[PDB]
Amino acid sequence: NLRSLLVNPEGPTLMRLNSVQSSERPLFLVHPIEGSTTVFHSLASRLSIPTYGLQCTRAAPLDSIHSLAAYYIDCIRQVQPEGPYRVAGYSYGACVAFEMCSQLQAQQSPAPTHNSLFLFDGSPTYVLAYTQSYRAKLTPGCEAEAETEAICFFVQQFTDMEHNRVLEALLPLKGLEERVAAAVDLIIKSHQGLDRQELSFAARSFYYKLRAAEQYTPKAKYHGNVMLLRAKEDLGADYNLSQVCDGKVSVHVIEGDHRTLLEGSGLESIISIIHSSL
Ligand SMILES: O=S(=O)(c1ccc(-c2csc(-c3ccc(F)cc3)n2)cc1)N1CCOCC1
Predict the structure, then answer these.
(1) What are residue 252's phi and psi, to 5 degrees?
(2) Where are the alpha helices (DSSP H) in the chain?
(3) 21 CA distance to ligand 1 centroid (A)?
(4) End position of a domain, from candidates 215, 234, 264
(5) Are residue 37 and residue 96 in the same domain, yes or no?
(6) Which of 194, 215, 236 is the last residue of a domain?
């Protein structure tokens, strides 16, 4: 449960998530904001098609969602040099996976790709909505306050700490690196064996991941068909994919909350959707 929100920063970007060895083209699953593909382990074991995960390591460029997506496409081509391509993303990862498919569409433009894109409870706008809901709590222009807010939320994912207690400890500090180091020391106190470097990279990258999400708009609409599998403020029906897609937008409501949308009842529906979708 606990170290599943962490990435080995020295780990591989592309990783097998099942033993299925077949001719059928693989499904690539893109990480949530935590960067790890652990959240997909149940799905990947249950799928009859070869499944890989994309995890966000030291190798990943986080200057933009566009750079991240270009890098993930190059990694995919080390096992599947040619399309068509099956891509899914969960939560934050739904934004990224959508960018990857747009780039792939542009690579073959204007010939249509028969690529498959699945979004698990995310979209370019669903992530954007979340970031502002945090900017709402901040003095505009105060970057130190934004850094503090992001890193506080990260520390809260590991500890039972009250919001304002973490806010106090981070707000004074010189810059991001100091805040990152303060956050790692708090988490290390609760879990000493955890790796310094692992946590440092996780805290730092959490801030840059959020920033890239804020700066993202696709260069144009995604022309491919898309499927949204969203959990049981409210953004919209199709998570406003209609504004970023001029292809078929398919919406399915899936049992569970944002976190439990990939387990139990929700997981059964996702597996049946993917298995028929082929
Ligand atoms: O991947 S998510 O889409 C996600 C989006 C935003 C934040 C966040 C926390 S704090 C902050 C911030 C933003 C802008 C600032 F200026 C300062 C802080 N953003 C976390 C997770 N997902 C939402 C659904 O449940 C799981 C997580």
Answers:
(1) -130, 130
(2) 41-46, 65-76, 92-108, 124-135, 143-156, 163-170, 176-190, 196-214, 264-277
(3) 37
(4) 215
(5) yes
(6) 215
Q: How far apart are CA 259 and CA 125, in angstroms?
A: 18
Q: How far is the CA of 150 from the centre of ligand 1 (A)?
A: 7
**Angle at the Cα of 12 (from 10 to 15), degrees rounded to 5?**
145
Instruction: Name 65's Cβ contacts closer than 8 Å, sequence gap at least 6.
Output: 95, 96, 99, 212, 213, 215, 216
What is the experimental method? X-ray
Q: Residue 25 is encoded by which pair of tokens?
A: 């083209």
Q: Are residues 5 and 142 in the same domain?
A: no
Q: Cα(180) to centroid of ligand 1, in Å?
A: 17
Same domain, 121 and 225: yes
The residue to mutate among 31, 56, 98, 130, having the most atoms of ligand 1 within 8 angstroms of its beta carbon, is 130
- Which value in Å is the resolution of this experimental model? 2.8
Before 32, cis peptide (omega within 30)? Answer: no
Ligand 1, atom 25, residue with closest C-alpha:
258
Q: How many structural domains does the chain have?
A: 2
Question: Which of these, 86, 75, 95, lies nearest to 225 by C-alpha position?
Answer: 86
